Design a protein around this ligand. Structure first.
Ligand SMILES: COc1ccc(CC(=O)N2CCN(S(=O)(=O)c3cccc4cnccc34)CC2)c(OC)c1
Ligand SMILES: COc1ccc(CC(=O)N2CCN(S(=O)(=O)c3cccc4cnccc34)CC2)c(OC)c1
Ligand SMILES: COc1ccc(CC(=O)N2CCN(S(=O)(=O)c3cccc4cnccc34)CC2)c(OC)c1
Ligand SMILES: COc1ccc(CC(=O)N2CCN(S(=O)(=O)c3cccc4cnccc34)CC2)c(OC)c1
Ligand SMILES: O=c1[nH]cnc2c1ncn2[C@@H]1O[C@H](COP(=O)(O)O)[C@@H](O)[C@H]1O
Ligand SMILES: O=c1[nH]cnc2c1ncn2[C@@H]1O[C@H](COP(=O)(O)O)[C@@H](O)[C@H]1O
Ligand SMILES: O=c1[nH]cnc2c1ncn2[C@@H]1O[C@H](COP(=O)(O)O)[C@@H](O)[C@H]1O
Ligand SMILES: O=c1[nH]cnc2c1ncn2[C@@H]1O[C@H](COP(=O)(O)O)[C@@H](O)[C@H]1O
Lengths: 330, 330, 330, 330
């Protein structure tokens, strides 16, 4: 084996991240303005815009969830707060008209009660929210939820970064599989644990397990530009979950921060010291970006442009687009 | 598939940019001073110097087109202005003696009238000027022009970055095919849409469709050094179109700008906010470089040196030269 | 041969370093808190924590060796001092309770006497401490020690970076093989001699020679993050030796240094001018990191997290984990 | 073809530079202090140290040639000065005892007279000094010299970067072949002409043509560290020619330059504007490094260390050593 040892499987793959690829233009009669950006969030739920906001306490509370739904996407309410408060945020969103909303739950002792209070509050999507879903406890929680409240509520499981893990979630009954172990902008799992999977390869592998079962893949983490959304969807994802790209918006939690004459907002991992109070996330800042509506417009604008270049009339068509791999120089 | 999924065609190629390759020296009895730098701009038009200036409003108006033609190249007048003004710039150039000149047209509602006014003004080359020529409207415009005024005017179509797109333009009747989707120095399509094709690979692919039909390829975008011109031509292109490399010259539109004691000129994408007034270009600055004549001398000087090292007596010979691929370290 | 010449073996392999790979998550029912971090230092000695401190005079004297042993690892006392002083440091450590301790010896004229004084002082591990163990003198020293005092003392040999060198040490009787030629943070062998071997590949190759004989591999040098420890062990190493990561701790030799309002400690190669008084190491500084106990907690915390993600209940299981290779972009 | 087009030979090879490889350690009983560093400069001339100084006017005049010869290497006197002055510098060197000296000649109108005046002055080596030796005029000059004065004077030809070019020089009668097109530290040929060949691959290819005919290869350009000398020789070169590494020494031409409290000397390409008065070199500065004797000691010290690690008792043995290819991360 050229990289060492005698086992070809020790280094199992070459992992590509968003920056490693570009979408190839293709024959097109699709105008960006006329592309259909709708896509499946879950088996049953289709969004007008294929974007959801991260379940993080510097990204999504009621104000963000409301704005996301109004923009045609959805918010996933974070779970770093008491059960009654999270359920009350669900109520606040559903009060704002017929708006879709999701909410994160863990697999700990209080997770089941949290999920039931969220169901009672009228949540549409429960996101079983972990860093490693390939685990009997996580799979059992997914299955239990789907068998208990699965007629009225869609159940997302995550996160995974391998084909086998995605397959396990599908088998457990997941209505969507969320992909991303290590790619988050505020993630230090890569350096702390030495664990991760570049996101283009992780999406390609997850989709290989999920698409044949009609289960949509949510690409979660590592998206830095509007172009990354197009790349994630072309790799086979049905939606993208965004943290950093939405953390600078007016609707995110947190105050404005002024440093060196420029405006920022705090953005922190849910595995950072501050969020937990061995951290696997940092506490950082992102530039202030203004109203969510405007950020989403620009992001969807880039997606539309990609659909124009690739001749993709729908997201389903975009999922069939081809990449070129680029070098460091490119 | 080593990079993920089960489809070998999902990642269709490995795309090289100019910085990924160098020209290999070869047996040579050609002195740089004695090389023949002439090359086909179109099927019928041969330039003394294989360089054309970008159809941009911070690069080519009448003054630049005149200087380019006098230097042995050609200018393509930009189309970000009323039809009567563009046609009047064509008249200004043709007034300066028997000078070649080209002009850009779109495929919008006013494009046909623009093209006819340009024909009436005595233009030699019409450039159907788009970001994505693999499109029925663009192909139809190319064909219509070629069938209507194609006896007296040469019709360039662009831009493309794939073999199939180049093939479609050839079939539509293009007299030259312009290659470049995403490589421009002021381009943000790569980040905004996630779309592009590294330019060496894009030229190799386009030439594979165009050369067998005797249709010249114009390499447009991404050329940063005189050496890139040699590389583009060796990859099979017949001419190169330059924006950034010519934007700093006295003959380009725009005022001198002084920042931190150094001189610059404004250089902006035609897809930037300022040019359009979701942008796919930026508004920037390039160092002031002095008279066009001197910049072209240096650029052709580098090309001549390359022809010396590779034993290329003509451009046609240079198109047969070989590359070495280099690593990040090199 | 694509990279030149006609000999495919001239460039013998593609060497990967820690930054070239990530651990892939795998099915897991292992909680980080419950993983077993114990591992073989030598054929006979098992540590609670798979970490040893470098035999360097800015890393390990008695204070560090005591703290390392108490944390469940071990210190290797450096040999840049008189024999009586080194032996006295061994005595100081053994005085602090039943604590494991190792000590470095060379292969020079005074090396045998040094090793016997260390044996008399009650050392548990002798580390034949060289930059190139594939050498008859080093192999002979290893063998002599193992045949003379090998019933009561374990003999480590190093350093190596190839399969053949590791094999030679095994055959000489080594109880453990230490791997690392050129990767140290303060190493300049790579630039001075042009010699080295990227550490993931070097570990994979050494383990291929050592594991089939039940000889543990110590990964020495190049570990910058807690995640690198997990990577080294997954590549097949049984323990990791750390210099830079432990040099900033309270227990390391040397004074606190204040520059630009921040705290540092001196950290220098044993091949630096200052340590020797043609240098193959530099004299540098590392940030002050506080008590050893806390640094080890964080490092083991990262290892535990990796064992969680990879479903490794023990180190032996972690040694079977798989990598993904990443690009420069990732 | 994965990188574009249908011609596998268009991109002829993957070129490696010094930074792309490291020497693998090997079984060794060679102490650095006892290695034999002698090597063939030409078919007939063997140096004690395998290093020659560049024929540049900021590197080698009489003072440098004398110091190089005394250190066991050789200087090649530059040719950017009148014939009588260059010949007089040869006389100055031969006056300093039995010291080897070389001198550059071109292939221009005054080149033959220059070569004869140098022969009359007692030169030992004539270096036919060009940027592209694969040319009938250069090959003819080499042959003419070898047939005219080749009994008493050794004739070096260069520079080349391909197997075919090296083969042509061998056939012309070269006593040594000098390799390097584009790698020099002050070289801009790569950017100006887009022409070059990474030096490890260029040496491997040249050696493949030269070694079977017993013609030594001189590695010229791109050597930044003492370790690069070992790498060049292991790739098959017999000696290395150094410019930048020797330009900072007391014996180089030029004054001391003080900028920002640090000492420098001027170092400029022979293709820079200043040396010629379309430039293919820059005018720069290198740190002042003190006496040549000390720089050579450090450089040979690194070479010796490499011979120690690779078990090379002689240079001839070092030429058989193996590389590992490294990634950007390494
Ligand atoms: C098999 O048993 C296990 C397996 C794994 C863990 C780790 C774990 O649960 N956490 C808590 C969540 N974070 S995170 O906030 O930083 C995070 C949040 C969402 C997405 C992530 C994606 N990649 C990295 C971190 C992510 C990481 C550490 C575990 O802990 C008990 C037990
Ligand atoms: C299939 O239907 C489509 C397909 C594509 C588009 C995009 C489009 O027409 N534009 C306007 C031109 N720009 S540009 O100025 O930035 C530009 C100018 C020239 C060369 C370029 C090369 N690569 C990138 C940008 C370039 C990009 C956006 C579209 O819009 C209606 C409709
Ligand atoms: C075959 O004969 C030989 C072979 C090799 C050597 C070199 C040698 O012994 N030394 C002394 C030790 N250093 S070091 O302190 O920098 C060092 C310390 C530990 C680990 C290292 C890992 N990689 C690099 C340097 C390392 C390098 C130079 C030699 O010298 C007489 C004789
Ligand atoms: C086939 O006919 C030819 C072919 C080639 C040339 C170029 C040429 O002779 N020169 C003059 C020498 N320089 S240089 O000083 O910069 C130089 C000096 C030594 C080593 C070099 C290695 N790589 C780059 C530059 C180098 C480059 C330009 C030519 O000119 C008439 C005619
Ligand atoms: O602390 C953390 N460490 C690692 N990943 C995190 C952490 N907090 C949230 N995440 C994940 O990172 C995603 C946001 O990634 P981003 O959009 O690149 O900033 C989130 O949706 C989570 O999946
Ligand atoms: O706004 C823009 N975005 C992307 N490409 C542009 C834009 N404006 C012009 N171009 C293209 O970029 C080329 C100039 O590239 P440059 O020489 O690298 O600066 C032009 O000839 C166009 O093909
Ligand atoms: O001077 C030196 N040059 C090269 N390697 C050294 C030197 N001193 C110690 N080492 C090795 O570098 C290791 C520490 O590497 P680090 O943890 O990356 O700093 C040590 O355990 C030695 O194996
Ligand atoms: O102006 C120049 N342009 C390109 N190469 C040059 C020039 N002048 C000298 N050289 C070559 O560069 C070598 C020195 O390379 P260096 O040791 O990397 O600085 C010289 O021996 C020449 O072969």
């Amino acid at each position: 084996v050229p990289t060492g040892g005698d086992d070809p499987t020790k280094i199992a793959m070459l992992g590509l991240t968003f920056d490693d690829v570009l979408l190839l233009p293709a024959a097109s009669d699709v105008l960006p303005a006329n592309a259909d950006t709708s896509s499946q969030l879950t088996k049953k739920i289709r969004l007008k815009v294929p974007l959801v906001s991260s379940a993080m306490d510097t990204v999504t509370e009621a104000r963000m969830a409301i704005a996301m739904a109004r923009a045609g996407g959805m918010g996933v309410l974070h779970r770093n707060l008491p059960v009654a408060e999270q359920a009350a945020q669900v109520e606040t969103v559903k009060r704002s008209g017929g708006l879709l909303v999701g909410a994160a739950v863990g697999v700990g002792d209080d997770a089941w009660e949290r999920a039931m209070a969220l169901r009672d509050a009228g949540v549409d999507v429960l996101v079983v929210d972990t860093a490693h879903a390939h685990n009997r406890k996580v799979l059992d929680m997914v299955h239990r939820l789907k068998t208990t409240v699965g007629d009225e509520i869609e159940v997302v499981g995550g996160n995974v970064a391998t084909r086998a893990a995605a397959a396990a979630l599908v088998e457990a009954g997941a209505d969507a599989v969320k992909v991303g172990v290590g790619p988050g902008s505020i993630c230090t799992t890569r350096v702390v644990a030495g664990v991760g999977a570049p996101q283009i390869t992780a999406i390609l592998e997850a989709v290989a397990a999920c698409a044949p079962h009609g289960v949509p893949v949510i690409a979660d983490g590592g998206l830095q530009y509007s172009g990354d959304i197009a790349k994630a969807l072309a790799a086979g994802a049905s939606t993208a979950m965004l943290g950093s790209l939405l953390a600078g918006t007016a609707e995110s939690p947190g105050e404005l921060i002024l440093v060196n004459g420029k405006q920022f907002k705090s953005y922190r991992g849910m595995g950072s010291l501050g969020a937990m109070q061995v951290p696997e996330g940092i506490e950082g800042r992102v530039p202030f970006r203004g109203p969510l509506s405007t950020v989403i417009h620009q992001l969807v604008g880039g997606l539309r442009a990609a659909m124009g270049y690739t001749g993709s009339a729908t997201i389903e068509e975009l999922q069939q687009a081809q990449f070129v791999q680029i070098t460091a120089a490119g």
